[PDB]
């Protein structure tokens, strides 16, 4: 079957690209909240 050698790294690295963005967003939404709150 497919060893997914190139997929593992890609699927792993691509995961980080979104995982990091999602996590960042997670705080972003809260940060932007205070950022905007203190600058409405």
């Amino acid at each position: 079957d497919n060893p997914s050698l190139s997929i593992d790294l890609t699927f792993h690295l691509l995961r980080t690209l979104l995982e990091l963005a999602r996590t960042q967003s997670q705080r972003e939404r809260a940060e932007q909240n205070r950022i905007i709150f203190d600058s409405v």
Side-chain angles (χ1 to χ4, degrees):
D1 303 51
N2 151 65
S4 258
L5 46 105
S6 42
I7 302 274
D8 186 4
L9 55 101
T10 311
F11 247 63
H12 242 117
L13 67 86
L14 92 83
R15 140 172 309 282
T16 297
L17 99 81
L18 51 91
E19 215 114 73
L20 85 87
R22 288 289 107 82
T23 271
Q24 215 63 266
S25 181
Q26 201 64 273
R27 57 158 59 105
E28 211 231 90
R29 57 202 64 170
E31 243 63 273
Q32 262 33 48
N33 245 270
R34 47 170 50 105
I35 294 294
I36 297 295
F37 243 102
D38 266 76
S39 172
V40 291

